[PDB]
Amino acid sequence: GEQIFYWSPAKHWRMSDEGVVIGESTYTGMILEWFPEFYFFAQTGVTINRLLERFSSGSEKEANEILELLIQDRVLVEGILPPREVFSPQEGLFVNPYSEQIRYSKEALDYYVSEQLNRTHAACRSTKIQLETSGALPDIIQKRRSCRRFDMKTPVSFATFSNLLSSLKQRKEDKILYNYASAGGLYPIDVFVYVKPRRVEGVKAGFYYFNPADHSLVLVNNIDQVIKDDHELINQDIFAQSAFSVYLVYNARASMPKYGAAGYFYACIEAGIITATLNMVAEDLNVGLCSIGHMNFEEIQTFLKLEDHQVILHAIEGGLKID
Amino acid sequence: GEQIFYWSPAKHWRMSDEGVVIGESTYTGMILEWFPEFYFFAQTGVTINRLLERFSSGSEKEANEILELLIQDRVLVEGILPPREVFSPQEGLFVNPYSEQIRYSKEALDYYVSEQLNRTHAACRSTKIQLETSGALPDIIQKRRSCRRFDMKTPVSFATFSNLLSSLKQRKEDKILYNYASAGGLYPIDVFVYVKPRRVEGVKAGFYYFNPADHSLVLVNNIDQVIKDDHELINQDIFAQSAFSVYLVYNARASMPKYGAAGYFYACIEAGIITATLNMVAEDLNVGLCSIGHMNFEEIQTFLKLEDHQVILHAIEGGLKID
Amino acid sequence: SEPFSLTEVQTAYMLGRNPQFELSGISPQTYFEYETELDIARLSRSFQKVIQRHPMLRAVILPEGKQQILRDVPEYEIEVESLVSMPPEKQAARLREERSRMIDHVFPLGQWPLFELKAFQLQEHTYLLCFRYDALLMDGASMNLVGQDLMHYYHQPDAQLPPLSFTFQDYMHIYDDMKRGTEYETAKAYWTNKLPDFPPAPSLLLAKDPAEIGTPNFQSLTTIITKDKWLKLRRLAQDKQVTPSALLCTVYGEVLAFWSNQRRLAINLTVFNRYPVHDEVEQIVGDFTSLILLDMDMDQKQPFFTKVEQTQSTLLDGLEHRHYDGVEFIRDYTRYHQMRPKAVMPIVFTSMLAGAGAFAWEEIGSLRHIHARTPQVYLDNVVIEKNGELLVSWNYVEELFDAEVMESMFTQFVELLDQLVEQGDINPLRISQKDYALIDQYNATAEPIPAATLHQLFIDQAQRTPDQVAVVFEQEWLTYSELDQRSNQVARFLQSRGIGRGDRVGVLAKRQVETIINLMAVLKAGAAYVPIDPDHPYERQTYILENSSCKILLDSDLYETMEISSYADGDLTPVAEPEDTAYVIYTSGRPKGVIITHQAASNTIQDINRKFEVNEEDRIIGISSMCFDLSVYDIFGTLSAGATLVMIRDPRDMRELVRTVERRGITIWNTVPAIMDLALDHVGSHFENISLRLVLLSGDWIPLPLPAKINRHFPVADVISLGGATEASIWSIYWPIEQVEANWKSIPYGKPLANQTYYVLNYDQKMCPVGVIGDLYIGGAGLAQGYLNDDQKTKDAFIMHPEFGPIYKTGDCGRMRPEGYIEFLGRQ
Ligand SMILES: Cc1cc2nc3c(=O)[nH]c(=O)nc-3n(C[C@H](O)[C@H](O)[C@H](O)COP(=O)(O)O)c2cc1C
Ligand SMILES: Cc1cc2nc3c(=O)[nH]c(=O)nc-3n(C[C@H](O)[C@H](O)[C@H](O)COP(=O)(O)O)c2cc1C
């Protein structure tokens, strides 16, 4: 009945003179006496008392503090990791030829970007097919621009709000269909919508679950709220002026049983899908949108009561276009 | 100039009576005799002559056979891992509530899919807002469908091919703009285009790099060939019938310097923005497209002479629709 | 009144009566019809009187295999029917019914008369007597003997002639006693010693097999030679001290030897007038026929009359050994040579020249019709002297021959006789007519190709598409501009060591891209190259360098070891001319070098690339070893098109060959038939390839079923059959294969490619008639210059023909088919 913890796949163990080193931190005291056997034992999945009997046989007080820290430090974890943890080890494989200034000097960044936007592939042979510039794209794509300011006084009309959400609804044509593709046809992304007070017509403030099958918003949480301090400051104005915000959540049970690990990857692709679809509809509806790369997801998954199999992957802010 | 190998971060190991277990394989001999010191050295990046200097002290042949096997088994690796290796360890965290039969039995799978398409979020309250279906979507989105059947007699016209590719070209409006949103404005994904003999007007068979600033294709490789055995059986009909294909390649050097691991993640998302944008244009142009879940990318990466920092993240097959 | 033994010929007539033997079942039968003014009742009475005088006419043949004169017979009456009241058309209907019936009807054994006589009165003084008899009964000499006495009695019924005192039964007694010793034994020894090497009968250009004939159907080609021509031929024979029989046999022999492409030929010759036996034998009725075989040899350069004299001596000696029958000889011969009961001697010569009397039957009345059929005969050349008229008749089975060939052969016979009459010798037979035109157009292949040189073709293509990849092996490859820069440095190196025009450089056949660079450099500098396979037994590798007198061997590991990179890579001064040797290839280990010039090599390449529209999008799979001439096409043929060449590391791995075509998109296959056949057995039923557009199968035999496997696995490829010689510029003869096009046992060898000709020659180097098998020769612009360091072989293989120019004897055997192509029958 105890929770099962696993040696995190993202943590690499090593020994030093100070103590046990896991990832970025050094542990000292009794933990050093737990050896490689702790490392091996933990890989199968253990309960806290099973583990303690195997490695303590001394005061449980010290053993409990050690084990508690390892859990708090994400050495011993309960389940699937979010993408920020999943890709972390890759930084140890990448070699950076550029200075750190890209992140500090806006000029260093502008220079960097200009080199990148003019890059070519090294293996290119000395030939060339010049393509025609004679065509045109539909306006829905070519006139679309990111929106960083919104109408703060006019509530989003109900019809507009509903029409935008409808872009992801289910259709039945002798089977269930969507307006976008999914790997394996499973559609494993749950959508949650957050609405601020008096900003969306017909909608009370709160966190709602969107069900494409019902074409409706089910209230999840009308107690808590999203605050500006849950965001990186660079995005605090987008957050402050938006009317609503949408979160995309990956449901592992809706993918992993069919594809295994590949399913998580495919979902990460699907997140680009959907977003682009929604953006096109927003253009037809005169609605502005701006995506966000990172925010405090731990507080949000707590608010939404997400389960062990649910991972937040992405979020988008928006409101009516302002003129 | 000697190749440096790293302990692959995706591998974990245990001691056993049979020998040492790394990942899924059991080894005996010097490798067992080596203990964590081998592990710790491999962990920081070491070239072969250095590993032999430190870990041989036995027959040279024995030392060499062990290191060769570990490289072949991807225990020791050169650099950044592809997505299939990156997400592999998550398999040990997911627990499948369904039987394994959903991956073998058509009926078991159909059950799985139908059940999942009607799933909802458990933590919901008993109240909701019903959305209207009174609005409309444009045909460019609502009528799009994946195609697995192509017109193998009509070549793709040159103008059609150019207009489809123009969907991803650069525009100059006091800065470089694209027809879609991406990254932090870095656009770190390269496009490679592959053409089969006589299936595209004006283009010789081969692998070309697309340069969005010029609106041109430059040949990289016109010697090797893509064959049906580079595809899983489920997609061999698609392979046989398609005219051309597009590969999406992520440049770690274009993103990692600013975002670290997150850059890989964001690129995974960006690929789906690009994909959706492209499909919209393809429908106006009557070009069928289909995403591929898996392909022999290692052979393709070899053909394109991709470098250590480059990885294929996504590929799309297509041609004129059968009609 | 007792039965007697048969002569060996009569025994043979009896054996030939058996339907089980080839073209047998017909005891020889003869039909006659004559026109007279003389009354039947009197001729009929005269007929019975001749039976009384000539009791052999009263003979019966028994099923026993013996002959007996009947004690007596029912008296025979010539049946006479009057057609006098009938119009000529109806009279003819009756005469035609009796003639047809007498010709097809056969006398039963045990039938008492062995003759049948029926006559018609067409006018009160016009009579036609139709009659027939079985050959076992009597000779032709006997037939006229009877006619003379019969007409005697017509006119003088009471001028009683004496009975034969010496009778056939006495004749046969002596026969049985003679065949015990003396001359029998002497003749037997003569023939016994000759038998082991007696020649075969000549083989004619038959339209059909004897099995397809069954009952023969005879037709004839006839002519009468006038008395003046006959006397001129006799005088010629007199001047040459020979008999006209040798003169005629020799002319006949020329026709047969020409048409059959024979040097020696056995001729069935019929012997006349028995053995002396007694004082009255030429005065009795019986069969005096005996067989002799004539051993003729026409392999001469010598004058016509010389051949006649040789024939005469042969005839004269053979006839002194008549005491052993040719029937016995042939029995011994066919057992000796295991010929079995086959129609072994179907070509026969018969002569009554100075071997006939006044023709008692024509004294009775004019001959209107005559016909005879014998078993196992294809053609009977019979010559008769008739009161100075020379009668020539060729009786032949129409079912066995093409009528035009048959008319042509007869025509030639007569023309040769006319030349002997006017000049005294003859022109050798030759054929043209409705044949010459086919060969004349078959060889009309000239085309305007400049040839130039092999490296020039490369140089210009390299300038047109410098960044194209030319040579591919693994993940390593070279471009056209790279080949020129690298080969310019190597050529300067070779020039700088004293290697120039007229010299030779040996090269090793290794699978390296640098191999091509070294190969091109040798040619650019003006030297010929000699390829060596590194896996040849070492002593052979050394043999060739020494035997060919090469100056240096170039291994592949030279660029980095000879400091080639220190040399300029700019343009070279041109050296080679189209007439220079490009290469010398050693073949047929002992081996001889074959000298090939740039012009010959180029014309083959230019024609193949133009005919198959070879271009820059093509891919050639380099399966074949560099030790073959075949590889020249792949290397130079690729470079002149701007196409890509792929090297194969190990040609034996058929799976590798399959992997290569699938992974590289190969469009042109170029192998000997064995490789395609083996590669296809590593291919499952699910396999399909649509990259090959052209398959060249070159040399060796192509199985008729092979295209089936090629077509199902490579449904879009064009399969071509190519033949030729290495002593010629790789390919000479072309034929596409459009499925198995016919019910046949062979794939047409084909027709010449461009600026090349082909001939089929007889034993004396003259053209063979279409359908006749002879030696195969090639001519035209594709020829090699001879063998390197072997003069005797060059002398016999490369010859100058007085009509066709230089030609090469391949020594293969074959024939032209009237359809417009060459069919070959292998080497032998
Ligand atoms: C990342 C991704 C990979 C996919 N891989 C494959 C594949 O390998 N083979 C295939 O037939 N379909 C594949 N599909 C599934 C279909 O493309 C698509 O989801 C299905 O047709 C339903 O959507 P639609 O009605 O818009 O076509 C893939 C889709 C995505 C998003
Ligand atoms: C995955 C992802 C995350 C992003 N996160 C942020 C963010 O946190 N803050 C922000 O203002 N813009 C963000 N952007 C950048 C903008 O969305 C936009 O793509 C960029 O400014 C290009 O602007 P454009 O409309 O002129 O093409 C993000 C884009 C992507 C694709």
mmCIF file with all atom_site columns, C-alpha atoms and ligand atoms in Angstrom, chain A residues 144-148 232 234-235 238 289-294 314-315, chain B residues 175-185 187 265-267 269-270 273, ligand 2:
data_model
loop_
_atom_site.group_PDB
_atom_site.id
_atom_site.type_symbol
_atom_site.label_atom_id
_atom_site.label_alt_id
_atom_site.label_comp_id
_atom_site.label_asym_id
_atom_site.label_entity_id
_atom_site.label_seq_id
_atom_site.pdbx_PDB_ins_code
_atom_site.Cartn_x
_atom_site.Cartn_y
_atom_site.Cartn_z
_atom_site.occupancy
_atom_site.B_iso_or_equiv
_atom_site.pdbx_formal_charge
_atom_site.auth_seq_id
_atom_site.auth_comp_id
_atom_site.auth_asym_id
_atom_site.auth_atom_id
_atom_site.pdbx_PDB_model_num
ATOM   1  C CA  . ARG A 1 144 ? -0.873 35.693 -39.330 1.00 0.00 ? 144 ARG A CA  1
ATOM   2  C CA  . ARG A 1 145 ? 1.310  37.426 -36.678 1.00 0.00 ? 145 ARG A CA  1
ATOM   3  C CA  . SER A 1 146 ? 1.958  36.813 -32.959 1.00 0.00 ? 146 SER A CA  1
ATOM   4  C CA  . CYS A 1 147 ? -0.177 38.940 -30.630 1.00 0.00 ? 147 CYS A CA  1
ATOM   5  C CA  . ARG A 1 148 ? 1.381  40.618 -27.584 1.00 0.00 ? 148 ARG A CA  1
ATOM   6  C CA  . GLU A 1 232 ? 8.982  34.256 -16.009 1.00 0.00 ? 232 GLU A CA  1
ATOM   7  C CA  . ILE A 1 234 ? 9.439  38.423 -19.554 1.00 0.00 ? 234 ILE A CA  1
ATOM   8  C CA  . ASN A 1 235 ? 5.881  37.080 -20.018 1.00 0.00 ? 235 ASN A CA  1
ATOM   9  C CA  . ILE A 1 238 ? 1.181  38.846 -21.837 1.00 0.00 ? 238 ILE A CA  1
ATOM   10 C CA  . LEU A 1 289 ? -2.619 34.184 -29.488 1.00 0.00 ? 289 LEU A CA  1
ATOM   11 C CA  . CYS A 1 290 ? 0.902  33.906 -28.042 1.00 0.00 ? 290 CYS A CA  1
ATOM   12 C CA  . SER A 1 291 ? 2.554  30.706 -26.889 1.00 0.00 ? 291 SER A CA  1
ATOM   13 C CA  . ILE A 1 292 ? 4.629  30.338 -23.734 1.00 0.00 ? 292 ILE A CA  1
ATOM   14 C CA  . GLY A 1 293 ? 7.732  28.117 -23.484 1.00 0.00 ? 293 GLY A CA  1
ATOM   15 C CA  . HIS A 1 294 ? 7.950  27.749 -19.698 1.00 0.00 ? 294 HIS A CA  1
ATOM   16 C CA  . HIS A 1 314 ? 2.675  23.399 -23.354 1.00 0.00 ? 314 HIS A CA  1
ATOM   17 C CA  . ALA A 1 315 ? 0.517  26.486 -22.814 1.00 0.00 ? 315 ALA A CA  1
ATOM   18 C CA  . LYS B 1 175 ? 13.445 41.646 -40.583 1.00 0.00 ? 175 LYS B CA  1
ATOM   19 C CA  . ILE B 1 176 ? 13.293 38.002 -41.551 1.00 0.00 ? 176 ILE B CA  1
ATOM   20 C CA  . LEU B 1 177 ? 9.815  36.592 -41.281 1.00 0.00 ? 177 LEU B CA  1
ATOM   21 C CA  . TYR B 1 178 ? 8.465  33.181 -41.896 1.00 0.00 ? 178 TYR B CA  1
ATOM   22 C CA  . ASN B 1 179 ? 4.992  31.914 -42.639 1.00 0.00 ? 179 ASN B CA  1
ATOM   23 C CA  . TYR B 1 180 ? 4.879  30.182 -39.301 1.00 0.00 ? 180 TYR B CA  1
ATOM   24 C CA  . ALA B 1 181 ? 5.962  30.788 -35.710 1.00 0.00 ? 181 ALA B CA  1
ATOM   25 C CA  . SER B 1 182 ? 9.007  29.047 -34.258 1.00 0.00 ? 182 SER B CA  1
ATOM   26 C CA  . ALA B 1 183 ? 11.307 28.646 -31.274 1.00 0.00 ? 183 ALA B CA  1
ATOM   27 C CA  . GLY B 1 184 ? 12.485 31.932 -29.866 1.00 0.00 ? 184 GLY B CA  1
ATOM   28 C CA  . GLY B 1 185 ? 12.632 33.125 -33.484 1.00 0.00 ? 185 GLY B CA  1
ATOM   29 C CA  . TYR B 1 187 ? 14.069 28.489 -36.728 1.00 0.00 ? 187 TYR B CA  1
ATOM   30 C CA  . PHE B 1 265 ? 12.372 19.710 -26.724 1.00 0.00 ? 265 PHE B CA  1
ATOM   31 C CA  . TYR B 1 266 ? 11.216 22.856 -28.354 1.00 0.00 ? 266 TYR B CA  1
ATOM   32 C CA  . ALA B 1 267 ? 12.421 21.610 -31.711 1.00 0.00 ? 267 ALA B CA  1
ATOM   33 C CA  . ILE B 1 269 ? 7.239  20.865 -30.892 1.00 0.00 ? 269 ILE B CA  1
ATOM   34 C CA  . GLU B 1 270 ? 8.234  23.092 -33.793 1.00 0.00 ? 270 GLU B CA  1
ATOM   35 C CA  . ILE B 1 273 ? 3.905  23.624 -36.513 1.00 0.00 ? 273 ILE B CA  1
HETATM 36 C C1  . LIG D 2 .   ? 7.496  26.374 -28.208 1.00 0.00 ? 2   LIG D C1  1
HETATM 37 C C2  . LIG D 2 .   ? 7.492  27.913 -28.255 1.00 0.00 ? 2   LIG D C2  1
HETATM 38 C C3  . LIG D 2 .   ? 7.556  28.638 -27.041 1.00 0.00 ? 2   LIG D C3  1
HETATM 39 C C4  . LIG D 2 .   ? 7.562  30.083 -27.015 1.00 0.00 ? 2   LIG D C4  1
HETATM 40 N N1  . LIG D 2 .   ? 7.598  30.758 -25.807 1.00 0.00 ? 2   LIG D N1  1
HETATM 41 C C5  . LIG D 2 .   ? 7.513  32.104 -25.748 1.00 0.00 ? 2   LIG D C5  1
HETATM 42 C C6  . LIG D 2 .   ? 7.508  32.894 -24.454 1.00 0.00 ? 2   LIG D C6  1
HETATM 43 O O1  . LIG D 2 .   ? 7.620  32.309 -23.386 1.00 0.00 ? 2   LIG D O1  1
HETATM 44 N N2  . LIG D 2 .   ? 7.343  34.272 -24.508 1.00 0.00 ? 2   LIG D N2  1
HETATM 45 C C7  . LIG D 2 .   ? 7.047  34.899 -25.677 1.00 0.00 ? 2   LIG D C7  1
HETATM 46 O O2  . LIG D 2 .   ? 6.683  36.051 -25.617 1.00 0.00 ? 2   LIG D O2  1
HETATM 47 N N3  . LIG D 2 .   ? 7.157  34.298 -26.893 1.00 0.00 ? 2   LIG D N3  1
HETATM 48 C C8  . LIG D 2 .   ? 7.391  32.947 -27.034 1.00 0.00 ? 2   LIG D C8  1
HETATM 49 N N4  . LIG D 2 .   ? 7.539  32.294 -28.286 1.00 0.00 ? 2   LIG D N4  1
HETATM 50 C C9  . LIG D 2 .   ? 8.030  33.097 -29.477 1.00 0.00 ? 2   LIG D C9  1
HETATM 51 C C10 . LIG D 2 .   ? 6.785  33.622 -30.227 1.00 0.00 ? 2   LIG D C10 1
HETATM 52 O O3  . LIG D 2 .   ? 5.828  32.603 -29.965 1.00 0.00 ? 2   LIG D O3  1
HETATM 53 C C11 . LIG D 2 .   ? 6.922  33.779 -31.761 1.00 0.00 ? 2   LIG D C11 1
HETATM 54 O O4  . LIG D 2 .   ? 6.980  32.459 -32.277 1.00 0.00 ? 2   LIG D O4  1
HETATM 55 C C12 . LIG D 2 .   ? 8.151  34.595 -32.259 1.00 0.00 ? 2   LIG D C12 1
HETATM 56 O O5  . LIG D 2 .   ? 8.107  35.916 -31.723 1.00 0.00 ? 2   LIG D O5  1
HETATM 57 C C13 . LIG D 2 .   ? 8.116  34.797 -33.790 1.00 0.00 ? 2   LIG D C13 1
HETATM 58 O O6  . LIG D 2 .   ? 7.236  35.926 -34.057 1.00 0.00 ? 2   LIG D O6  1
HETATM 59 P P1  . LIG D 2 .   ? 6.461  36.246 -35.443 1.00 0.00 ? 2   LIG D P1  1
HETATM 60 O O7  . LIG D 2 .   ? 4.897  36.139 -35.286 1.00 0.00 ? 2   LIG D O7  1
HETATM 61 O O8  . LIG D 2 .   ? 6.860  37.650 -36.035 1.00 0.00 ? 2   LIG D O8  1
HETATM 62 O O9  . LIG D 2 .   ? 6.776  35.272 -36.472 1.00 0.00 ? 2   LIG D O9  1
HETATM 63 C C14 . LIG D 2 .   ? 7.507  30.827 -28.298 1.00 0.00 ? 2   LIG D C14 1
HETATM 64 C C15 . LIG D 2 .   ? 7.427  30.062 -29.518 1.00 0.00 ? 2   LIG D C15 1
HETATM 65 C C16 . LIG D 2 .   ? 7.416  28.635 -29.518 1.00 0.00 ? 2   LIG D C16 1
HETATM 66 C C17 . LIG D 2 .   ? 7.329  27.906 -30.865 1.00 0.00 ? 2   LIG D C17 1
#
